[PDB]
C-alpha cells in the first residue's frame, strides 16, 4: 500500500508499531479486535476542531424523498 498509494511513511511506521504490539501480546487476533478503532477515533472522529476555510457542496433533497432524488447546486465557502 505504501508503494502503490504513496502513503506517508510516518503513519505506516505507526501501523507497523501496532502490528508488532499485537504480535507481542497473548493473542494477536484478540488484540487487533480490541484495538481496531485507534485510527478512526483519532483522525476521522476528531477532525476540524478549529476550522479556517474550504468548500462544502450544496446539495438539495427533492420530493418525494422516498425517491432519493438529489440535485447538485454548487459550493459554499466554509467558516
Amino acid at each position: 500500500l505504501q508503494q502503490t498509494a504513496g502513503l506517508d511513511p510516518s503513519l505506516v511506521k505507526l501501523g507497523v508499531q501496532i502490528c508488532l504490539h499485537a504480535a507481542a501480546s497473548s493473542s494477536y487476533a484478540w488484540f487487533i479486535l480490541k484495538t481496531k478503532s485507534i485510527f478512526p477515533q483519532n483522525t476521522l472522529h476528531s477532525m476540524y476542531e478549529s476550522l479556517e476555510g474550504g468548500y462544502c457542496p450544496n446539495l438539495e433533497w427533492l420530493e418525494p424523498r422516498s425517491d432519493y432524488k438529489f440535485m447538485y447546486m454548487g459550493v459554499m465557502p466554509l467558516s
Binding site: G53, G54, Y55, G74, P77, L78
Partner: protein, 50 residues
Amino acid sequence: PIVQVSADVENKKTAQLLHADTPRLVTWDAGLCTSFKIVPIVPAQVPQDV
C-alpha cells in the same frame, strides 16, 4: 463568472462587513470615583526637641 471573484479566502474588509467587533459599553466600578491623590513629599519632623 463564478470561477472569478467567488473564493474562500476573505480579506479584512469583507470580514468587517460580515462581522464587526462589538464595543463593550457597560462597565462597572466598585471603588472610589476619584482621580487625584495626596502624596507626602517630606516626612514630618517627629520626634522633635520642642
